[PDB]
Amino acid sequence: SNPHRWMMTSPGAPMVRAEFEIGELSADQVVVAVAGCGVCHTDLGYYYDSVRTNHALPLALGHEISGRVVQAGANAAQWLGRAVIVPAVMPCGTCELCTSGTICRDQVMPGNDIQGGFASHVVVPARGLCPVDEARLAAAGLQLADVSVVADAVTTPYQAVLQAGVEPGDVAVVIGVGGVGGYAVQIANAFGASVVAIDVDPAKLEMMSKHGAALTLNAREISGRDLKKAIEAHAKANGLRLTRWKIFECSGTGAGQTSAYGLLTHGATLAVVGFTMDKVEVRLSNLMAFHARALGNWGCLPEYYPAALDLVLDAAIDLASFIERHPLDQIGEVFAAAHAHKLTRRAILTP
Amino acid sequence: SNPHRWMMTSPGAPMVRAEFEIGELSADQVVVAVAGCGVCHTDLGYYYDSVRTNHALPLALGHEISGRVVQAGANAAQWLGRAVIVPAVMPCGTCELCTSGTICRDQVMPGNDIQGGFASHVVVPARGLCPVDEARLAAAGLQLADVSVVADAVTTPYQAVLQAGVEPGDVAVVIGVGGVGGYAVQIANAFGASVVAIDVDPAKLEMMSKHGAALTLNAREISGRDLKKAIEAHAKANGLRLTRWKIFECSGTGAGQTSAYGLLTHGATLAVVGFTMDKVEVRLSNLMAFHARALGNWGCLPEYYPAALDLVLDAAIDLASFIERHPLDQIGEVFAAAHAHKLTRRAILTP
Ligand SMILES: [Zn+2]
Ligand SMILES: [Zn+2]
Ligand SMILES: [Zn+2]
Ligand SMILES: [Zn+2]
């Protein structure tokens, strides 16, 4: 009857099942009954890399949540009974930076600032919730649990592609085609680009070959120079621009960043999507010679969640080949498998 | 009677005076009688760093030219007798990249692609010439020779400031306040920013204090952290934004680039204006945390030369405190003095 969460008591300690009572809600809170929560590099950071959470321990992680609003504060009652995706990052929506949001000084994330989605239920602010059309979901052969990874995994690269002005005629180049990079490929394709997938993993390439990558390049097989000349071949074959390439570093490695920076051409955009604390060695002045720009992406404004979901509902992109469902009570095994890079798809924990 | 040039026969060889005959011009060429040619880091690169020129030696350097059109091909005759600034870089204006220019694959520069302005006369294409209102020049206590440095030295940072969307309420921060950086300060001020001048040279700061720098910070005296906190003081004093700072790296050093990258704040723009082949160590992912962008500037579209000159004519910026006039036949002494960093202003060689 009572809900439960699986919490981190300490980084690397076994996750502990903990019942909790909802009680009275504040005016602008809802309870979502969790269908699914994605397992993210950000969660593994808290657990394995002991990254500080803003909420004190113990804390349930998980910030990629779909489910149903089953209880609501008086101001949020219009959410009752509706299928939703919770935004991974909720800007204050009231500060001058939100008025004019991704960097909002008062932005809040589940599984960091408040109790997360590795739970039967999660209490979240109602601001920025994305409704799911349940008819359209069912048609597409998708569970409500499946669209959990629209939060962050789809929306982060959606924001990055939109911000880079990816348009028909363009070559899009994405480095690191697991997780976020996989969706950068699918979305750049949907936006009208001819996409080049670059990864060290042949299986990832094979997969992206079937879902929007017009070209694949194994970065193990091929140094900086062959990389460029292979993409120009692709461009000239299909009558595509040889300038103004839209490059997305999605691996979040120094190796990927060196490799992406290496592929700058005249008027190109380099989108920095993958987070790492690693420093690279680059000559900043390459940006000058190419009259190029480097655009830093942080997450995704909630306002874009409906459009990203729309891509999924309409089969313009595919989630199903990129997700795998596990029991929430196997969170330990899944965390351990994701950390050892044993997972070939994004894990969704399901109560 | 015959014109003459001072040519580089070989990098580091004494410059040699060489008479030449103009002869018949092609349809779209003019002869400018040189009033003045600026002495640029780019010239010193050819001479001291043996950077390859596209024209074979011997070659007269100099690409920052003002003077009078005294002869013209039939298609260019409307230029005859007019005071001009020659663009430092002339895009083809006919390629699809110019149609839609700074990076144009067919772009031409005096003192690199064709004979330069260290000469009594220079034969240039008429495309992109900037007329000078001689009445307005005289009023402002300026020689026609003086506006030679509008080419590159003023226009390069004009392009960079325009491209960064520098607007009232903004804090502009320019690192390296000699030459191009000095004009980035003056132009950001004219555009409505409150400008912070950062340099290692106290005399440069003193100077910029008098010409658009609302604040000066000696980068010798003060590490990364005090730098930020001093600028926030300035911002809060005058009611200015603490985000979306417009940062211009104008020194073209790794030291300056590290220092500028270090000053990224939320929504900031980092303009890369100074060229160097030096590589820096930075975490590219700072661009993400700040939702920031890095914009590479190459030169300036000829179309902006009238607006930049307009700033000079109208006293909105000042050239006079930033120039020093020398005889063209002292090119050797001036090259040697600029290379040893003995010059406190931009040298203009005058026939
Ligand atoms: Zn995530
Ligand atoms: Zn806000
Ligand atoms: Zn120059
Ligand atoms: Zn062109």
XYZ file of C-alpha atoms and ligand atoms in Angstrom:
706
model
C 0.000 0.000 0.000
C 2.658 2.623 1.113
C 5.077 3.697 -1.653
C 8.785 2.788 -1.515
C 12.108 4.079 -2.890
C 15.535 2.464 -3.414
C 17.972 4.931 -1.837
C 21.733 5.484 -1.779
C 22.684 5.724 1.946
C 26.345 6.243 0.884
C 28.173 6.064 -2.479
C 28.981 2.363 -3.190
C 26.839 1.036 -0.220
C 24.092 -1.474 -1.211
C 20.891 0.441 -2.245
C 18.229 0.155 0.523
C 14.431 -0.299 0.004
C 12.605 2.308 2.182
C 8.796 2.688 2.540
C 7.604 6.327 2.964
C 4.178 7.998 3.486
C 3.090 10.739 1.002
C 1.042 12.793 3.526
C -0.444 16.243 2.635
C 1.087 17.762 -0.570
C 1.964 21.486 -0.971
C -0.187 23.434 -3.484
C 2.004 22.903 -6.631
C 3.261 19.298 -6.043
C 2.015 16.079 -7.656
C 2.693 12.413 -6.927
C 3.664 10.439 -10.064
C 3.285 6.646 -9.918
C 6.501 5.719 -11.757
C 6.105 3.616 -14.945
C 9.881 3.763 -15.612
C 13.058 5.661 -14.674
C 16.135 5.665 -16.999
C 19.598 4.784 -15.583
C 21.951 7.663 -16.453
C 25.695 8.440 -16.353
C 24.602 11.221 -13.903
C 23.201 8.570 -11.434
C 26.406 6.483 -11.742
C 28.353 9.719 -10.994
C 26.588 10.112 -7.630
C 26.939 6.414 -6.785
C 30.435 5.509 -8.194
C 32.165 8.970 -8.457
C 30.590 10.311 -5.142
C 29.483 13.557 -6.909
C 27.827 15.760 -4.205
C 23.979 15.765 -4.285
C 22.250 19.014 -3.094
C 19.760 16.922 -0.975
C 21.423 15.133 2.029
C 21.601 11.275 2.063
C 19.842 8.937 2.010
C 18.624 9.798 -1.521
C 16.804 7.875 -4.287
C 18.548 8.659 -7.599
C 16.795 8.654 -11.002
C 15.813 11.717 -13.091
C 14.422 10.191 -16.362
C 10.811 9.529 -15.274
C 7.481 8.660 -16.959
C 4.313 7.638 -15.045
C 0.839 8.812 -13.977
C -0.127 11.722 -11.672
C -2.205 9.892 -8.931
C -2.299 12.725 -6.337
C -2.006 16.532 -6.580
C -1.885 19.690 -4.465
C -4.828 22.067 -4.958
C -2.999 24.263 -7.550
C -1.892 21.163 -9.596
C -5.207 19.203 -9.657
C -5.516 19.559 -13.521
C -2.683 16.934 -13.688
C -4.755 14.217 -11.871
C -4.920 10.883 -13.800
C -2.713 12.059 -16.730
C 0.334 10.202 -18.167
C 3.467 12.429 -17.951
C 7.198 12.688 -18.528
C 8.870 14.661 -15.679
C 11.545 17.130 -16.863
C 15.088 16.023 -15.783
C 15.808 19.698 -14.925
C 13.050 22.128 -13.829
C 14.014 25.866 -14.151
C 12.472 28.291 -11.627
C 10.377 29.770 -14.505
C 10.050 32.987 -12.389
C 13.718 34.413 -12.400
C 14.701 36.981 -15.091
C 16.917 34.266 -16.750
C 13.827 31.966 -17.156
C 11.516 34.967 -18.076
C 13.901 35.688 -21.044
C 16.550 28.697 -18.379
C 18.964 25.748 -18.837
C 21.525 27.503 -16.498
C 18.813 28.955 -14.035
C 20.590 29.449 -10.635
C 17.452 28.058 -8.893
C 16.946 25.006 -11.251
C 15.934 21.697 -9.549
C 16.562 18.063 -10.582
C 14.981 14.851 -9.232
C 17.551 12.351 -7.807
C 19.794 15.330 -6.801
C 17.772 18.228 -5.253
C 14.671 16.114 -4.340
C 13.952 12.361 -3.933
C 14.264 10.619 -7.356
C 12.410 8.181 -9.625
C 14.059 4.853 -8.461
C 10.780 4.448 -6.570
C 7.112 3.333 -6.868
C 6.218 7.085 -6.505
C 7.988 10.470 -6.718
C 6.708 13.858 -5.417
C 7.685 16.558 -7.935
C 6.720 20.171 -8.643
C 4.053 20.276 -11.397
C 6.018 22.976 -13.362
C 7.081 21.808 -16.869
C 5.396 18.332 -16.801
C 5.018 16.888 -20.342
C 1.644 15.158 -21.070
C 1.782 11.809 -22.990
C -1.029 11.021 -25.529
C -1.698 7.401 -24.414
C -3.513 6.402 -27.665
C -0.471 7.560 -29.771
C 1.990 5.743 -27.393
C 0.093 2.381 -27.708
C -0.097 2.587 -31.557
C 3.744 2.925 -31.737
C 4.302 -0.348 -29.771
C 5.679 1.593 -26.737
C 4.929 1.226 -22.942
C 4.447 4.450 -20.846
C 7.690 3.182 -19.077
C 9.562 3.393 -22.463
C 9.166 7.228 -22.847
C 10.895 7.768 -19.420
C 14.195 8.243 -21.422
C 12.695 11.136 -23.393
C 13.771 13.039 -20.167
C 17.499 13.913 -20.696
C 18.460 11.051 -23.109
C 16.262 12.349 -26.026
C 15.688 16.020 -24.920
C 19.389 16.922 -24.236
C 20.443 16.238 -27.886
C 17.064 17.645 -29.168
C 18.080 20.984 -27.476
C 21.636 20.714 -28.986
C 20.372 19.967 -32.555
C 17.769 22.766 -32.388
C 20.399 25.267 -31.032
C 22.925 24.365 -33.825
C 20.442 25.343 -36.626
C 20.688 21.854 -38.215
C 18.865 22.274 -41.572
C 18.423 20.365 -44.908
C 21.604 20.344 -47.092
C 23.702 20.085 -43.860
C 26.064 17.277 -42.913
C 25.641 16.420 -39.225
C 28.630 14.567 -37.577
C 28.085 12.976 -34.155
C 31.006 11.574 -32.141
C 29.959 8.924 -29.575
C 26.733 7.239 -30.687
C 25.728 5.501 -27.412
C 22.833 7.044 -25.421
C 22.543 10.822 -26.052
C 24.671 10.575 -29.274
C 22.343 7.887 -30.663
C 19.399 10.342 -30.303
C 21.536 13.247 -31.751
C 21.914 11.029 -34.904
C 18.149 10.256 -35.052
C 17.095 13.904 -34.412
C 19.638 15.519 -36.822
C 18.221 13.070 -39.471
C 14.617 14.087 -38.609
C 15.687 17.807 -38.843
C 16.894 17.133 -42.455
C 20.694 16.559 -42.055
C 22.619 13.674 -43.646
C 24.239 12.200 -40.505
C 27.713 10.647 -40.071
C 27.994 8.380 -36.972
C 31.567 8.103 -35.550
C 32.245 5.646 -32.679
C 35.010 3.173 -31.554
C 32.282 0.443 -31.159
C 31.313 -1.409 -34.395
C 28.052 -2.759 -32.836
C 26.920 0.861 -32.018
C 27.656 1.867 -35.654
C 25.767 -1.204 -37.049
C 22.799 -0.139 -34.873
C 22.912 3.572 -35.934
C 23.281 2.463 -39.646
C 19.648 1.228 -39.228
C 18.316 4.442 -37.446
C 19.373 7.677 -39.273
C 23.162 7.355 -39.863
C 23.624 7.768 -43.668
C 27.368 6.959 -43.025
C 29.339 5.146 -40.242
C 33.069 5.641 -39.419
C 34.936 3.426 -36.916
C 37.239 5.925 -35.112
C 39.510 2.913 -34.183
C 40.190 2.097 -37.909
C 40.749 5.718 -39.166
C 42.811 8.831 -38.059
C 41.726 12.538 -38.371
C 42.437 12.840 -42.163
C 40.642 9.771 -43.663
C 37.674 10.786 -41.394
C 37.277 14.195 -43.200
C 37.843 12.712 -46.718
C 35.243 9.921 -46.106
C 32.569 12.561 -45.147
C 33.337 14.802 -48.199
C 32.797 11.634 -50.342
C 29.338 11.181 -48.711
C 28.580 14.951 -49.207
C 29.579 14.955 -52.937
C 27.695 11.629 -53.558
C 24.363 13.125 -52.281
C 24.955 16.814 -53.312
C 25.443 18.141 -49.758
C 27.343 21.188 -48.400
C 31.154 20.766 -47.800
C 31.041 23.726 -45.275
C 28.898 24.623 -42.190
C 28.986 21.024 -40.832
C 27.009 20.447 -37.609
C 29.370 18.455 -35.286
C 28.083 17.051 -31.933
C 30.589 15.701 -29.350
C 28.302 13.251 -27.472
C 30.869 10.781 -25.975
C 31.894 13.159 -23.129
C 35.546 12.031 -23.420
C 38.738 14.008 -24.165
C 39.291 11.431 -26.994
C 35.870 12.336 -28.561
C 36.431 16.143 -28.012
C 39.916 16.008 -29.689
C 38.312 13.990 -32.555
C 35.279 16.364 -32.994
C 37.524 19.553 -32.741
C 39.713 17.852 -35.374
C 36.714 17.763 -37.843
C 36.034 21.578 -37.845
C 35.539 22.884 -41.463
C 34.666 26.397 -42.760
C 31.613 27.921 -40.951
C 31.153 24.672 -38.887
C 29.283 24.453 -35.542
C 30.808 22.247 -32.794
C 28.111 21.293 -30.255
C 29.489 20.224 -26.849
C 26.808 17.826 -25.516
C 28.806 15.192 -23.499
C 30.016 16.280 -20.038
C 33.513 15.340 -18.767
C 35.937 17.096 -16.358
C 38.828 15.979 -18.685
C 40.856 18.852 -20.265
C 41.923 18.579 -23.964
C 44.812 20.294 -25.855
C 43.458 22.280 -28.866
C 44.436 25.533 -30.603
C 41.402 27.780 -29.911
C 42.487 29.741 -33.084
C 41.204 26.928 -35.389
C 37.771 28.554 -34.583
C 39.127 31.697 -36.326
C 40.564 30.023 -39.499
C 37.214 28.184 -40.007
C 35.042 31.167 -38.836
C 33.507 28.465 -36.554
C 31.642 28.441 -33.232
C 31.548 26.044 -30.248
C 28.084 25.825 -28.547
C 27.813 24.398 -24.990
C 24.528 22.507 -24.322
C 23.101 22.065 -20.784
C 20.012 19.802 -20.687
C 16.788 21.030 -22.372
C 14.093 23.628 -21.620
C 10.883 21.767 -20.591
C 9.049 23.652 -23.429
C 10.717 21.295 -26.040
C 9.589 18.016 -24.347
C 6.283 17.833 -26.352
C 8.171 18.227 -29.735
C 10.799 15.574 -28.787
C 8.044 13.144 -27.620
C 6.155 13.940 -30.905
C 9.231 12.588 -32.836
C 8.942 9.315 -30.858
C 5.134 8.984 -31.192
C 5.398 9.613 -35.014
C 8.222 7.026 -35.534
C 10.447 9.915 -36.800
C 12.907 8.489 -34.200
C 12.939 5.016 -32.504
C 13.356 4.336 -28.702
C 12.530 0.564 -28.690
C 15.908 -0.678 -30.143
C 17.700 1.627 -27.601
C 16.017 0.609 -24.277
C 15.963 -2.463 -22.003
C 13.564 -2.965 -19.067
C 14.675 -4.219 -15.588
C 12.953 -4.576 -12.189
C 13.566 -1.562 -9.889
C 14.542 -4.060 -7.109
C 17.555 -5.162 -9.351
C 18.947 -1.527 -9.233
C 22.251 -2.832 -7.704
C 22.853 -5.376 -10.557
C 21.910 -2.749 -13.222
C 24.143 0.006 -11.671
C 27.048 -2.531 -11.527
C 26.424 -3.687 -15.194
C 26.094 -0.064 -16.538
C 29.331 0.967 -14.648
C 31.272 -2.017 -16.114
C 29.813 -0.881 -19.540
C 28.086 -4.343 -19.937
C 24.728 -2.760 -21.108
C 24.176 -2.244 -24.913
C 20.965 -0.151 -24.387
C 19.588 2.364 -21.832
C 18.232 0.531 -18.730
C 14.713 1.560 -17.535
C 13.965 0.548 -13.869
C 10.276 -0.392 -13.505
C 8.561 -0.860 -10.101
C 58.224 59.808 -61.336
C 57.964 55.921 -61.405
C 56.430 54.381 -58.254
C 58.511 52.237 -55.873
C 57.974 49.478 -53.285
C 60.068 48.182 -50.358
C 60.115 44.405 -50.855
C 61.118 41.341 -48.839
C 63.499 39.344 -51.114
C 63.826 36.723 -48.317
C 62.623 36.572 -44.682
C 65.154 38.513 -42.518
C 67.092 39.947 -45.576
C 67.311 43.791 -45.686
C 64.159 45.224 -47.416
C 65.040 46.449 -50.959
C 63.680 49.623 -52.685
C 62.435 48.635 -56.199
C 60.992 51.023 -58.843
C 58.196 49.487 -61.003
C 56.062 50.748 -63.945
C 52.223 50.604 -63.604
C 51.501 50.011 -67.334
C 47.954 49.213 -68.633
C 45.517 48.173 -65.823
C 42.921 45.354 -66.170
C 39.250 46.476 -66.190
C 38.560 46.215 -62.390
C 41.956 47.368 -60.953
C 42.860 50.767 -59.489
C 46.172 52.329 -58.481
C 46.083 53.838 -54.961
C 48.758 56.421 -54.108
C 49.501 55.261 -50.546
C 48.977 57.848 -47.757
C 49.846 55.253 -45.070
C 50.192 51.497 -44.475
C 49.927 50.011 -40.925
C 52.657 47.627 -39.646
C 50.926 44.420 -38.506
C 51.787 41.215 -36.602
C 50.844 39.508 -39.937
C 53.706 41.389 -41.771
C 56.186 40.478 -38.989
C 55.011 36.835 -39.401
C 56.083 36.807 -43.066
C 59.369 38.588 -42.329
C 60.453 37.079 -38.926
C 58.438 33.767 -38.787
C 58.869 33.030 -42.601
C 55.087 32.362 -42.961
C 54.506 31.338 -46.638
C 53.058 34.124 -48.863
C 50.803 32.977 -51.789
C 52.659 35.403 -54.183
C 56.330 34.379 -54.865
C 59.187 36.637 -53.579
C 60.197 39.370 -53.851
C 57.042 40.815 -52.223
C 56.122 44.182 -50.650
C 54.227 43.477 -47.404
C 51.576 45.804 -45.917
C 47.780 45.261 -45.908
C 46.430 48.231 -43.829
C 46.241 50.897 -46.572
C 44.657 54.357 -47.025
C 45.377 56.669 -50.004
C 43.905 58.103 -53.224
C 42.831 56.268 -56.418
C 45.018 58.041 -59.111
C 44.486 55.538 -61.977
C 41.713 53.038 -62.814
C 40.742 50.329 -65.299
C 37.674 51.121 -67.422
C 35.222 49.253 -65.101
C 36.638 51.023 -61.957
C 36.806 54.642 -63.266
C 34.146 55.851 -60.693
C 36.962 55.498 -58.068
C 39.240 58.107 -59.795
C 40.432 60.899 -57.420
C 38.650 59.499 -54.305
C 40.238 58.912 -50.850
C 39.903 55.210 -49.849
C 40.729 52.549 -47.288
C 41.609 49.231 -49.027
C 40.103 46.145 -47.334
C 42.825 43.949 -45.687
C 40.955 40.881 -47.047
C 38.857 41.010 -50.256
C 36.330 38.097 -50.614
C 35.525 36.909 -54.159
C 31.995 38.395 -53.730
C 30.819 35.971 -56.499
C 31.119 32.453 -54.761
C 28.035 30.992 -52.985
C 29.806 31.605 -49.591
C 30.097 35.381 -50.403
C 26.555 35.465 -52.030
C 25.143 34.233 -48.639
C 32.708 35.838 -46.858
C 35.432 36.078 -44.164
C 36.489 32.416 -44.929
C 35.922 32.693 -48.819
C 38.228 30.046 -50.441
C 39.122 32.620 -53.160
C 39.733 35.617 -50.757
C 42.753 37.868 -51.585
C 44.979 39.997 -49.310
C 47.515 42.706 -50.245
C 51.089 41.966 -48.996
C 50.359 38.189 -49.343
C 48.461 37.358 -52.597
C 49.396 40.614 -54.452
C 52.073 43.334 -54.008
C 51.408 45.262 -50.738
C 51.140 48.819 -49.392
C 54.821 49.337 -48.237
C 55.044 51.354 -51.459
C 54.336 54.775 -53.064
C 51.532 52.973 -55.037
C 49.615 49.666 -54.888
C 47.488 48.074 -57.672
C 44.409 46.482 -56.069
C 41.042 45.153 -57.245
C 38.365 47.865 -56.817
C 35.973 45.391 -55.038
C 35.117 46.448 -51.441
C 37.044 49.798 -51.403
C 35.843 52.073 -48.550
C 35.430 55.800 -49.470
C 36.748 58.382 -46.916
C 34.787 61.685 -46.453
C 37.808 64.066 -46.545
C 35.939 67.007 -44.898
C 34.961 64.761 -41.893
C 38.570 63.377 -41.629
C 40.111 66.928 -41.469
C 37.610 68.140 -38.791
C 38.655 65.226 -36.485
C 42.376 66.244 -36.589
C 43.281 63.099 -38.631
C 45.524 62.679 -41.776
C 44.275 60.368 -44.625
C 47.413 58.272 -43.616
C 45.933 57.854 -40.061
C 42.805 55.876 -41.210
C 45.077 53.227 -42.895
C 44.747 51.186 -39.601
C 40.954 51.084 -39.934
C 41.891 48.121 -42.283
C 42.302 45.064 -39.954
C 43.276 46.906 -36.698
C 39.815 48.590 -36.244
C 37.626 46.377 -38.553
C 38.726 42.944 -37.147
C 37.436 43.753 -33.600
C 34.437 45.707 -35.094
C 33.410 42.374 -36.790
C 33.999 40.459 -33.476
C 31.960 42.947 -31.345
C 29.103 43.027 -33.888
C 29.065 39.159 -34.116
C 28.974 38.778 -30.263
C 25.708 40.831 -29.964
C 27.362 43.318 -27.548
C 24.407 45.417 -26.271
C 23.640 47.964 -23.460
C 23.514 46.374 -19.947
C 26.379 44.017 -21.020
C 29.815 43.767 -19.442
C 32.466 43.450 -22.161
C 35.860 41.938 -21.032
C 38.835 42.248 -23.396
C 42.097 40.390 -22.719
C 45.144 41.985 -24.415
C 44.524 45.698 -24.977
C 47.350 46.475 -27.459
C 46.372 46.975 -31.135
C 43.177 45.034 -32.021
C 42.216 44.666 -28.291
C 42.479 48.443 -27.802
C 39.860 48.921 -30.582
C 37.689 46.034 -29.149
C 37.549 48.125 -25.892
C 36.650 51.357 -27.774
C 34.026 49.649 -30.014
C 32.360 47.572 -27.223
C 32.033 50.940 -25.333
C 30.506 52.628 -28.428
C 28.082 49.622 -28.783
C 26.862 50.303 -25.177
C 28.891 47.803 -23.040
C 30.719 48.709 -19.816
C 34.230 47.480 -20.724
C 36.865 45.812 -18.500
C 40.433 46.049 -19.923
C 42.773 43.209 -18.772
C 46.488 43.350 -19.731
C 49.936 42.547 -18.152
C 51.142 46.080 -19.209
C 50.201 48.939 -16.805
C 50.912 51.633 -19.473
C 48.386 49.942 -21.883
C 45.773 49.925 -19.065
C 46.466 53.627 -18.189
C 45.914 54.417 -21.897
C 42.659 52.363 -22.204
C 41.389 53.947 -18.885
C 41.206 57.194 -20.963
C 39.469 55.598 -24.080
C 36.444 53.400 -23.110
C 37.701 51.062 -20.324
C 35.315 51.663 -17.357
C 37.637 49.274 -15.359
C 41.306 48.114 -15.688
C 42.792 44.869 -14.241
C 46.547 44.120 -14.298
C 46.657 40.348 -15.051
C 50.197 40.297 -13.451
C 48.820 41.481 -10.029
C 45.675 39.223 -9.897
C 44.844 35.462 -10.469
C 41.601 34.035 -12.040
C 39.392 34.523 -8.900
C 40.056 38.188 -7.892
C 39.595 38.982 -11.653
C 35.931 37.714 -11.614
C 35.115 39.329 -8.205
C 36.540 42.739 -9.329
C 34.241 42.721 -12.452
C 31.099 41.731 -10.434
C 31.909 44.757 -8.173
C 31.945 47.014 -11.293
C 28.667 45.372 -12.554
C 26.814 45.819 -9.196
C 28.152 49.432 -8.813
C 26.625 50.498 -12.204
C 23.577 48.104 -12.241
C 24.909 45.817 -15.004
C 24.214 42.135 -15.837
C 26.257 39.470 -13.889
C 25.587 36.924 -16.755
C 25.995 36.942 -20.596
C 29.418 38.689 -20.425
C 31.027 39.460 -23.809
C 34.694 38.275 -23.508
C 37.224 39.023 -26.320
C 40.636 37.253 -26.328
C 42.680 39.831 -28.311
C 46.275 39.053 -27.127
C 46.626 35.948 -29.374
C 48.590 34.116 -26.639
C 47.886 30.827 -24.811
C 48.261 32.915 -21.578
C 45.439 35.301 -22.728
C 43.233 32.362 -23.993
C 43.599 30.466 -20.640
C 42.768 33.769 -18.834
C 39.700 34.611 -21.050
C 38.374 30.937 -20.903
C 38.829 31.245 -17.119
C 36.340 34.227 -17.039
C 33.351 32.346 -18.633
C 30.086 33.022 -16.651
C 26.476 31.873 -17.306
C 25.345 32.554 -20.936
C 28.737 34.257 -21.724
C 30.199 34.692 -25.246
C 33.969 34.107 -25.689
C 35.181 35.843 -28.875
C 38.470 34.452 -30.250
C 40.011 37.451 -32.079
C 43.825 37.021 -31.567
C 45.535 34.393 -33.756
C 48.234 32.067 -32.331
C 49.281 28.480 -33.229
C 49.753 27.825 -29.439
C 47.487 25.077 -27.963
C 45.877 25.637 -24.501
C 44.571 23.087 -21.920
C 40.867 23.767 -21.110
C 37.854 21.588 -20.259
C 35.549 22.156 -23.275
C 32.651 21.150 -20.891
C 32.839 24.540 -19.062
C 30.903 25.745 -22.205
C 28.103 23.363 -21.090
C 27.945 24.363 -17.361
C 27.749 28.071 -18.395
C 25.512 27.413 -21.486
C 28.250 29.480 -23.244
C 29.561 29.797 -26.808
C 33.019 30.420 -28.327
C 32.928 32.514 -31.574
C 35.965 32.482 -33.928
C 36.527 35.808 -35.781
C 38.425 36.002 -39.114
C 38.988 39.597 -40.311
C 35.936 41.677 -41.357
C 33.536 41.766 -44.326
C 34.319 44.906 -46.411
C 30.615 45.941 -45.983
C 31.366 47.023 -42.320
C 34.317 49.341 -43.220
C 32.059 52.457 -43.636
C 30.455 51.913 -40.130
C 33.878 51.376 -38.444
C 35.315 54.501 -40.185
C 32.109 56.391 -39.117
C 33.052 55.624 -35.437
C 36.473 57.246 -36.052
C 35.130 60.293 -37.960
C 32.506 60.908 -35.165
C 35.082 60.648 -32.295
C 33.063 57.650 -30.939
C 36.523 55.956 -30.962
C 40.036 57.560 -31.116
C 42.931 56.493 -33.477
C 45.349 59.426 -32.795
C 46.606 58.225 -29.325
C 47.108 54.710 -30.869
C 49.200 55.513 -34.015
C 52.737 56.748 -34.773
C 53.968 57.865 -38.217
C 57.337 56.758 -39.747
C 58.985 57.155 -43.179
C 58.405 54.123 -45.464
C 62.204 54.104 -46.166
C 62.759 53.324 -42.372
C 60.723 50.029 -42.770
C 63.767 47.987 -41.536
C 64.121 50.027 -38.267
C 60.310 49.906 -37.670
C 60.061 46.105 -38.358
C 63.024 45.549 -35.949
C 61.453 47.862 -33.236
C 57.933 46.269 -33.568
C 59.488 42.712 -33.373
C 61.467 43.629 -30.200
C 58.089 45.043 -28.880
C 59.714 48.559 -28.527
C 56.664 50.354 -30.145
C 53.835 51.621 -27.812
C 51.478 52.463 -30.761
C 50.685 51.092 -34.259
C 53.351 52.235 -36.792
C 52.042 53.750 -40.088
C 54.672 53.770 -42.934
C 54.225 56.891 -45.098
C 55.958 57.349 -48.495
Zn 20.054 11.495 -17.414
Zn 14.965 30.679 -13.154
Zn 46.914 43.703 -40.116
Zn 33.808 34.111 -52.295
